[PDB]
């Protein structure tokens, strides 16, 4: 994928947030930006450019699931790439991220290996 | 959901089918017909008239995963129903699955309740 894309981390610890931008700076990937909520990350994403959202499940004020549901109903972002990585690993929820539109689906704690694998399935299948 | 509703069980082995088979009658639902694995399914599907599938993972010829991927991808039969119900419980399995575009993931050994419970989560869900 071009190296410029521009990728918005999200997560309510900073810690994995870390993680996540560090790993991505080893792909090639420094146009990062961190959000701490759904909130944050919507607000964020609306100020536009932004073209791979990787986030987090279980967070204050809004939750990734509403995070996901809300950028796919969005006729401005309904297509932005949207990775969950998350250490909610119950079937029926892995389910309702996918249905609910997620692009792919990691859960933690997770290798480099992992993240790169399912970076490039997603930039596969969706050419980039 | 109507009873009438034509279900596809897949599966390698005959005593599973024969289980998800007498289960579905139980339930009302005696349109039901059987495949051995994905190419025995997809023949049976393009034959026309079948409103739900149910199929295992580990087979033969075509894999439940392979068979999952290529409904999906059909134009004609795209939005069909597939319950995977399997043995494989691996998280990184669900997942691929549920990504894949799984309706529902039953692991086995399941319970005529956990059937039962899945099969009607996906008619609520579908409006069935
Ligand atoms: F972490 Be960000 F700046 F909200
Ligand atoms: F808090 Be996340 F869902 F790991
Ligand atoms: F087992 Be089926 F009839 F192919
Ligand atoms: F063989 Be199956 F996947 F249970
Ligand atoms: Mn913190
Ligand atoms: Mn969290
Ligand atoms: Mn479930
Ligand atoms: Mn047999
Ligand atoms: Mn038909
Ligand atoms: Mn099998």
């Given at each position: 994928?071009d190296?410029?894309?521009?990728?918005?981390?999200?997560?309510?610890?900073?810690?994995?947030?870390?993680?996540?931008?560090?790993?991505?700076?080893?792909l090639?990937?420094?146009?990062?930006?961190?959000?701490?909520?759904?909130?944050?990350?919507?607000?964020?994403?609306?100020?536009?450019?932004?073209?791979?959202?990787?986030?987090?499940?279980?967070?204050?004020?809004?939750?990734?699931?509403?995070?996901?549901?809300?950028?796919?109903?969005?006729?401005?972002?309904?297509?932005?790439?949207?990775?969950?990585?998350?250490?909610?690993?119950?079937?029926?929820?892995?389910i309702?991220?996918?249905?609910?539109?997620?692009?792919?689906?990691?859960?933690?704690?997770?290798?480099?290996?992992?993240?790169?694998?399912?970076?490039?399935?997603?930039?596969?299948?969706?050419?980039?």
């Amino acid at each position: 994928a071009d190296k410029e894309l521009k990728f918005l981390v999200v997560d309510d610890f900073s810690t994995m947030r870390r993680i996540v931008r560090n790993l991505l700076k080893e792909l090639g990937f420094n146009n990062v930006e961190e959000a701490e909520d759904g909130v944050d990350a919507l607000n964020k994403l609306q100020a536009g450019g932004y073209g791979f959202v990787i986030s987090d499940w279980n967070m204050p004020n809004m939750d990734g699931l509403e995070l996901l549901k809300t950028i796919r109903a969005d006729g401005a972002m309904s297509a932005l790439p949207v990775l969950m990585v998350t250490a909610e690993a119950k079937k029926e929820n892995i389910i309702a991220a996918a249905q609910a539109g997620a692009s792919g689906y990691v859960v933690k704690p997770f290798t480099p290996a992992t993240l790169e694998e399912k970076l490039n399935k997603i930039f596969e299948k969706l050419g980039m």
